[PDB]
Structure 1
């Protein structure tokens, strides 16, 4: 990877997985009869993974400005983030994407726990346009997690509404495998979502909504999509452009 980093290019590296690397290091050590600690790992099991992941970076202009991004995989056991290795690694990384079979069997795939997932880099790394129509998204989904147990007869219109966004929004973030979306394809859907253009639509149709919205936008509004893809930001005009094109599709 560093080859690319050192040479002004950019790579990304997936470690599948670090759990099993640690297991391996263990085998070598015990057999060499190096002294064991917690779970029979050597003292320098931390130092192992630190060395590894610290190598990932964004180099400065003088260095060719190359970069190496890291997707280490860590396998919890019954969800135990306190487990020795997960502890080490979590405290090395700049955040976690967190998966749960619970969410998975609900049918929410990717099965990403939002409440548990953070990116310490965060804001600074987001298509300004996506960050424009989503500063509200973490807000809404936060309050939807807090009024969730109210899903079981006599709720006031305020906390009723909150459950109306949440279900649709969560639905909007399901995504079949192998089908990643272009940014200019995300921002429309997240727009129609956040600004309440799905509250009318039923929760099962949110499926076919995405497919038909995007293909329509392609034919009848390929120009706004192009501006998003190119400018990477949203004009005050572009916001009325999208707004108008949505309200047209939602009416239709």
Structure 2
């Protein structure tokens, strides 16, 4: 989603919510979540730490830190190292989560490194091996099999789109690597939707199975209904028929 829509907060809430499962027993229910902060102000990180200690949530979470003060090669190696820490949990069988905030800053870091290693620039000046860089990082998150002790390590990588350019090279490369998107719309954010989730650009292409059956039954077709609401309000601003109005009244509400 779009830059500094307090992007971090959306993910942070996931970390917070898992506390009745994380302060819960059963190691599957105990996610141990790693927040990788790359290219972030020492101040911003300090606020995160204080926030985590305010919700007392620090004890179930790790912070790996690679602030913007920290040197460009350190930043380059920052996601990879963090993912190793995550894999120890995953390969401890324990379920975990890793939020890599923001991989867009990892791109800038690898760009710096590559350019200072003088390998000729790639598209958007991001080096040509950037696809490999991201892909090797990204696919190290997995739900393992019964053989491997049913490991988990969920991954939420936080991509900072420049100006809502959803065709930008670094984002598109990431989009193609990952499955699902939770695109966050600035227009809605401005028009007071927190959390601003644009369902038009949010998909989960592998998410539906995960849903607990209660939340499949009750929520049945609501994605469809609110993808009728978008259409409805698309052509609302022509004449409105009572059918359209009923959907609109429901949709808005």
Gaps of 5+ in 2: 1-85
Alignment counterpart, residue 167 of structure 2, candidates 48, 66, 82: 82
Encode CA deviations 1:192-222: one digit per residue, 9 max, x unaligned: xxxxxxxxxxxxxxxxxxxxxxxxxxxxxxx
Gaps of 5+ in 1: 169-252
Query: For the aligned residues, what is the CA RMSD?
Result: 1.4
Number of equivalenced pairs: 168
What is the match of residue 20 of structure 1?
Answer: 105
What is the match of residue 56 of structure 1?
Answer: 141
SS in 2 for 1:117: strand
Change (3 A) 1:139 1:20: same
How far apart in 1 are the matches of 2:180 and 2:239?
A: 39
What is the match of residue 9 of structure 1?
Answer: 94
Encode CA deviations 1:159-202: one digit per residue, 9 max, x unaligned: 1101011011xxxxxxxxxxxxxxxxxxxxxxxxxxxxxxxxxx
Matched, 1:36 2:121: yes
SS in 2 for 1:91: helix
What is the match of residue 71 of structure 1?
Answer: 156
What is the match of residue 171 of structure 1?
Answer: none
How far apart in 1 are the matches of 2:241 and 2:124?
A: 51
Matched, 1:138 2:223: yes
What is the match of residue 167 of structure 1?
Answer: 252
Task: Give the CA deviation at 1:152.
Answer: 5.2
Alignment counterpart, residue 147 of structure 1, candidates 218, 226, 232: 232
SS in 2 for 1:13: strand
Greater RCO (Cα-Cα under 8 Å, separation 6 or more): 2
Matched, 1:112 2:197: yes
SS in 1 for 2:200: strand
TM-score (norm 1): 0.64
Encode CA deviations 1:75-131: one digit per residue, 9 max, x unaligned: 111111211100110001111111112101221110110111000112101011011
How far apart in 2 are the matches of 1:25 and 1:154?
A: 53
Alignment of 1:187-198 (within 5 A): none
TM-score (norm 2): 0.64
Q: Between Structure 1 and Structure 2, which shows a larger proportion of helix residues?
A: 1
